[PDB]
Subunit: 84 residues, 4 copies
């Protein structure tokens, strides 16, 4: 249920394709389009929709950011080190 | 050092202003501009820069996403419930 | 060759589908994804690529902005009135 | 009143500062933030607001795209050549 647990789950699913979202294969460009569209959706939901809708969009944004981390070999420690 | 720990730290700093980034006062629009500009920076860094640069940009994005959550009263449980 | 001429060409192609890009049918959400992704690409090219590459990305952005105008029934006069 | 005329007006105002918006001085990064935030505003207005509000946001996006062209030395011919 932790951010760290779900991330390790994604690193394993990326070790290989046709089941769960394999954007890692498509690459940075494809993942970047999603990050960018989701950020706009997060802003949109935060402004016009309810808390639940905003939380759903935020989860999609986080998911794609995590996928981008997996695609570039970035770890939670690398990111956390900067969150300070 | 956990995503959950840093988030609770921000919820407290939002209980009041002029010290650490108080975007919560400015509102959703101000935070949204940041989320959107940071997403594009994340994509840019992921494509042209190194792993560390990408991780720094990602941390900035996550920070602003967390701020947006604080501003809208969204909790980690709300978001995590959707990450599944 | 004028912005105004190409726009009127697009308004006609939207009067009906399967030839040239018919995003008007898919709707605002689909065109919005493109505008938001191209905006980031424009920023990216402007920063890391040459003038021609940046011009190509800018043309893609303008095209999708124009499509959004068509999809929402917005005219050049409506927009131009605000450009002042 | 034409896209081409307003653009030539901006090229002259960029020949020098403190009157009309001088982004050109601040550079690509500052203009890029605007392009990226305006694209999200364009999408937002297109989805939730009226035609006029969408037109106003579109005008702001075009203005900044034009400024970006000025800042990078890109001409209308360069862009128009690609719009085909």
């Amino acid at each position: 249920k932790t951010f760290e647990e779900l991330f390790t789950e994604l690193q394993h699913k990326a070790a290989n394709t046709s089941r769960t979202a394999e954007l890692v294969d498509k690459g940075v460009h494809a993942i970047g389009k999603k990050v960018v569209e989701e950020a706009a959706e997060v802003w949109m939901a935060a402004e016009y929709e309810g808390k639940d809708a905003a939380a759903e969009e935020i989860s999609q944004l986080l998911y794609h950011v995590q996928v981008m981390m997996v695609a570039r070999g970035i770890s939670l420690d690398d990111v956390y080190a900067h969150l300070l």
